[PDB]
Write a protein that binds this DNA or RNA. Structure first.
Ligand SMILES: [Mg+2]
Ligand SMILES: [Mg+2]
Ligand SMILES: [Mg+2]
Ligand SMILES: [Mg+2]
Ligand SMILES: [Mg+2]
Ligand SMILES: [Mg+2]
Ligand SMILES: [Mg+2]
Ligand SMILES: [Mg+2]
Ligand SMILES: [Mg+2]
Ligand SMILES: [Mg+2]
Ligand SMILES: [Mg+2]
Ligand SMILES: [Mg+2]
Ligand SMILES: [Mg+2]
Ligand SMILES: [Mg+2]
Ligand SMILES: [Mg+2]
Ligand SMILES: [Mg+2]
Ligand SMILES: [Mg+2]
Ligand SMILES: [Mg+2]
Ligand SMILES: [Mg+2]
Ligand SMILES: [Mg+2]
Ligand SMILES: [Mg+2]
Ligand SMILES: [Mg+2]
Ligand SMILES: [Mg+2]
Ligand SMILES: [Mg+2]
Ligand SMILES: [Mg+2]
Ligand SMILES: [Mg+2]
Ligand SMILES: [Mg+2]
Ligand SMILES: [Mg+2]
Ligand SMILES: [Mg+2]
Ligand SMILES: [Mg+2]
Ligand SMILES: [Mg+2]
Ligand SMILES: [Mg+2]
Ligand SMILES: [Mg+2]
Ligand SMILES: [Mg+2]
Ligand SMILES: [Mg+2]
Ligand SMILES: [Mg+2]
Ligand SMILES: [Mg+2]
Ligand SMILES: [Zn+2]
Lengths: 50, 60, 122, 89
RNA sequence: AGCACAGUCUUAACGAUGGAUGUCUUGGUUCCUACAGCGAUGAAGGCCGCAGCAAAAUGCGAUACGCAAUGAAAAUUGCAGUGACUGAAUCAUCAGAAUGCUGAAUGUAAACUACACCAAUUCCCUGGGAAUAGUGGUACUCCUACAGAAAA
RNA sequence: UUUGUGUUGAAGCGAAAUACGUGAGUUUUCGUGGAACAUCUCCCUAGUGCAGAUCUUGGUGGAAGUAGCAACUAUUCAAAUGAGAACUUUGAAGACUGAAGUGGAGAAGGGUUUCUUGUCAACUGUGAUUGAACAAGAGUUAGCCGCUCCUAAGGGAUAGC
RNA sequence: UAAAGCUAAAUAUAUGUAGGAGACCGAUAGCAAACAAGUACCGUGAGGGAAAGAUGAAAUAGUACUCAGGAAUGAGCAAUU
RNA sequence: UGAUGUUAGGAGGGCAAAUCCGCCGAAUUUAAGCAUAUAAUUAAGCGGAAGAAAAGAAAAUAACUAUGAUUCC
């Protein structure tokens, strides 16, 4: 909705922040194996549950 | 780059003065990083640690 | 262990302790044997290998070659000698990694720290 | 009718029964009773029952950060006097 | 340049698809031994933040992937950087200092970063000189003192 | 417990044998494989032998290039871009919605789908240079619009019981 | 010798933490979880709950060069082992 | 003697449970059916502690040539 509370809007911002891919230079590390983030979300497919 | 043992003999007034000038320098570095001038982005770590040491001495 | 029951002889436990050792403990693991000449000058039998020492290679495809240690890699458990090199498929040059237990060292680089060790080790 | 008990009446189904809960963070706070169906927030206790072993272990003592308790171990074998410090040099 | 009908079924040789078999294991399981609670001096749990480039997990708290002190003791790295000729680069120990908003949650409320009353508050030199709308206190029940008032 | 094989190639697997046994099975050859494997000299021990249970988990068929890709009146000519245009863009036509509109503005619900630039591995059940897909950066400004205040049907508490 | 009171040891421990061990299991087995596992995901809610280990001694050897092709990719007299 | 007091100094509240203390309280099942009985002074529910808790120094046994606080094998 356009009408929101403070806390809910902060939660929406936090949940948008965590939907980004792994940094590219982090792949060039040694001792590392993580190719891609296994927790990725699309808006039309999985609901936040709020 | 500062060491704790060289600070133990200072007075409170000048300890606070050193903290203030460190804060000004860190603010300047952050302002410079906000613009696309990444020449000195590696100096922030040292200034942060220096702030921590000065506060440690003052609080003890 | 052999006769004290307060330490383990289990393959699982001490094979786990080897591969997750803290960086401070890894330098004691990376030790090499002394030559006969250095075994009379010093009473010691072996020392942890350090950077600017001089070594002789005793096992592997590069056995017999001598040189100076240029770098130590505590995470891969290997050392690098000055003229034992390699070509990548690009053509770029690198060093060949040698395990410190395949090596005997023939000349030390002494300083304040190693003096106090060689003194006690007598 | 046209909003019958299947597909039709599912379209009327907006609105919320539960929302986020202060004191446990789950979407389990009845907005009209004003009471959590998981932790029972308004009251002082925690609302846990012995017929659910699985639920009882999703939110026990060791499943969190243990912020203050974790620093309290290994004192029992050092047993220093409070205010002490190692010898200098 | 020439010669095999097509389909269906059978058998060999070489391949495709699929992930059994054998070998491996920083993981489980059971037994034995020792020790044992935390909290109004704010717990367990929840939320929000912190890195030069930084999503998760791990670690930390406006000093925020770490400060001081003690024991070792040259490196640490993807790039950029930082370090000695040993309070410094890194590891371990961990007693000093610091520890956001909440939560029994305790000034009144709560799908509010809403609203009260009382005391203005905090620094630096050694009585001056400064800064700041910032800080602290106020639940209920009960015990020992105390204070005055009231009945008798 | 005894006494044995292995980088001069173990276990496993595929095709076999002038081989042995009534039989369950032993044994050996060639190929692949790259690190372990037995004991029949005699004993001990068990989560110890599969064709089925509309058995459990995983993988694969004939059906089969088959059923099907039919609501919502309808498309055509030229040009641009591009490796490649019936379903991207431009111009010209022929038409629809017909103010009770696929026109404007809000609530509940969603949470960045909004904007600019780039771009096609997968998706957009035909194509695709398109896109609500993917990537990098941006964007929401109040004394007067609202909440915040009042009381309602009602909820939670205090004293006592 | 009731209608008041205190008291160590020999006993127990499917919890938490640390140490040792076995004629135990060996990735459809063993805890649900050998891995960012009470995680991803489902339900208004109380709750439900997975799949997923192995190149090589070394990648401080992870595929340079040429030709064809818009590319993907293929081939070689060319290349690591 | 009640009450009042932001008077001074203090205590209680929540989490955790394998072992421990107090209350409350079933049915499945067996009896080849079933009602007493059994399951069981158990599961679920509500309160309170410790490195152990509880119990404990005879208003106890015996009937002997007599033993002698509690606990456990
Ligand atoms: Mg809303
Ligand atoms: Mg939907
Ligand atoms: Mg119905
Ligand atoms: Mg309702
Ligand atoms: Mg024929
Ligand atoms: Mg206690
Ligand atoms: Mg927090
Ligand atoms: Mg010193
Ligand atoms: Mg030091
Ligand atoms: Mg409050
Ligand atoms: Mg309101
Ligand atoms: Mg009360
Ligand atoms: Mg065998
Ligand atoms: Mg091998
Ligand atoms: Mg069986
Ligand atoms: Mg079968
Ligand atoms: Mg057809
Ligand atoms: Mg289409
Ligand atoms: Mg019409
Ligand atoms: Mg018309
Ligand atoms: Mg009309
Ligand atoms: Mg758009
Ligand atoms: Mg676009
Ligand atoms: Mg298509
Ligand atoms: Mg997107
Ligand atoms: Mg108005
Ligand atoms: Mg009313
Ligand atoms: Mg008595
Ligand atoms: Mg007693
Ligand atoms: Mg074990
Ligand atoms: Mg498993
Ligand atoms: Mg019966
Ligand atoms: Mg019967
Ligand atoms: Mg019956
Ligand atoms: Mg019970
Ligand atoms: Mg209690
Ligand atoms: Mg007692
Ligand atoms: Zn709750």
């Amino acid at each position: 909705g356009s009408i929101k509370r403070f806390r809910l809007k902060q939660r929406l911002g936090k949940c948008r922040r965590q939907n980004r891919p792994v940094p590219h230079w982090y792949r060039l590390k040694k001792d590392t194996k993580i190719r891609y983030n296994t927790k990725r979300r699309h808006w039309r497919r999985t609901k936040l549950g709020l | 780059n500062v060491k704790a043992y060289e600070l133990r003999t200072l007075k409170k007034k000048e300890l606070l003065d050193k903290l203030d000038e460190l804060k000004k320098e860190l603010s300047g570095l952050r302002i410079s990083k906000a613009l696309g001038n990444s020449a000195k982005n590696s100096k922030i770590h040292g200034v942060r640690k220096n702030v921590a040491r000065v506060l440690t001495v003052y609080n003890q | 262990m052999k006769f004290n029951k307060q330490k383990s002889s289990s393959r699982r436990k001490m094979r786990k302790a080897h591969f997750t050792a803290p960086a401070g403990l890894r330098r004691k693991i990376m030790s090499s044997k002394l030559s006969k000449e250095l075994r009379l000058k010093y009473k010691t039998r072996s020392l942890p290998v350090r950077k600017d020492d001089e070594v002789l290679i005793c096992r592997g495809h590069n056995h017999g070659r001598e040189g100076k240690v240029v770098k130590i890699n505590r995470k891969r458990y290997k050392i690098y000698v000055e003229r034992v090199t390699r070509e990548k498929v690009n053509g770029e040059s690198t060093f060949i990694g040698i395990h410190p237990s395949n090596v005997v060292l023939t000349k030390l680089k002494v300083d304040k720290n190693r003096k106090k060790i060689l003194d006690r080790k007598a | 009718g046209k909003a019958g008990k299947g597909t039709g009446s599912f379209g009327k189904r907006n609105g919320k029964t539960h929302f986020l809960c202060l004191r446990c963070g789950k979407r389990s706070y009845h907005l009209q009773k004003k009471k959590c169906a998981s932790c029972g927030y308004p009251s002082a206790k925690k609302r846990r029952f012995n017929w659910s072993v699985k639920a009882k272990r999703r939110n026990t003592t060791g499943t969190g950060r243990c912020r203050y308790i974790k620093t309290l171990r290994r004192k029992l074998k050092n047993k220093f006097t409070e205010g002490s410090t190692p010898k200098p040099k």
